[PDB]
């Protein structure tokens, strides 16, 4: 028993991280096959970052202007192109450690493991959720751009996030691995604000199921509720609308525990209207929303990779 914020094992991704340097700017890149993917602002100087014209900055660059270091081995760049907000650098050496992988674009509420890197060297791993406002609450310093987020499904690493920047509020923004931003943000150093965030209701319910599996039932009650009635209470507390598809995704946890989804909604409703009364759930005084239903199952059933 026990419930922890659990990241995927990171070994398959560690072997893919390289350092990319262009001029005086250094960040991380992802090396798969014979291509290194990295944020396009590596071609910026500190004077180029208020309103960079990336097209013109890149026309001025040749292959030899990009230095790619994999450990202490230099990979010669033999081609370069820009796809949305990422650069693709063709290199002379295919990564012999390329895992089975795909690029996926996730939706708000989905979670992923981040491998935080600096100078192409992994620093640590932690879990993140894509917030409803398309930010992530990460831990990132200067030089961390090009760090990636991922999930594993058995044999396949699914890359879903590349880190680019930090908003004034201290939260983080980035792209999918095709260079499309998550959220209404652009890669330049201007004042930008995310929309007011909301709580991921389906994940809170998953976490309540996790608590039940771990022997916490004090919040369960004998009341009932309709989907529509629950939503009316959820919005008042800045919670995302629970949908039928969310109700369906909670099937396996509901069947494992013998608690109907709507009965877990009735428990959550009362938690929202009355609080915890000085109590905790799974070691927490807040209602946690960065575990998905599948995150709960993979942890509580000991799924391996």
């Amino acid at each position: 028993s026990g419930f922890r914020k659990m990241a995927f094992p990171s070994g398959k991704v560690e072997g893919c991280m390289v350092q990319v340097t262009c001029g005086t700017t250094t960040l991380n890149g992802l090396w798969l096959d014979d291509v290194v993917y990295c944020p396009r602002h590596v071609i910026c100087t500190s004077e180029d970052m208020l309103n960079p014209n990336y097209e013109d900055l890149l026309i001025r660059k040749s292959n030899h202007n990009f230095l790619v270091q994999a450990g202490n081995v230099q990979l010669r760049v033999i081609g370069h192109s820009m796809q949305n907000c990422v650069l693709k650098l063709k290199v002379d050496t295919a990564n012999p450690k390329t895992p089975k992988y795909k690029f996926v674009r996730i939706q708000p509420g989905q979670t992923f493991s981040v491998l935080a890197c600096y100078n192409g060297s992994p620093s640590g791993v932690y879990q993140c959720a894509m917030r409803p406002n398309f930010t992530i609450k990460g831990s990132f310093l200067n030089g961390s751009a090009g760090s990636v987020g991922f999930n594993i499904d058995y044999d396949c690493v699914s890359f879903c996030y590349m880190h680019h920047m930090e908003l004034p509020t201290g939260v983080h923004a980035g792209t999918d691995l095709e260079g499309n931003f998550y959220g209404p943000f652009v890669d330049r150093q201007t004042a930008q604000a995310a929309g007011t965030d909301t709580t991921i209701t389906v994940n809170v319910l998953a976490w309540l199921y996790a608590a039940v599996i771990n022997g916490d039932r004090w919040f369960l009650n004998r009341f009932t509720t309709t989907l529509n009635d629950f939503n009316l209470v959820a919005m008042k507390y800045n919670y995302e609308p629970l949908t039928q598809d969310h109700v369906d995704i909670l099937g396996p946890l509901s069947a494992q525990t013998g608690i109907a989804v709507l009965d877990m909604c009735a428990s959550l409703k009362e938690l929202l209207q009355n609080g915890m009364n000085g109590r905790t759930i799974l070691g927490s005084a807040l209602l946690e929303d960065e575990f998905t239903p599948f995150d709960v199952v993979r942890q509580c059933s000991g799924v391996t990779f």
Binding site: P39, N142, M165, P168, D187, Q189, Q192
Partner: peptide, 6 residues
């Protein structure tokens, strides 16, 4: 503040 490109 402004966004920081990292």
């Amino acid at each position: 503040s402004a966004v920081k490109l990292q």
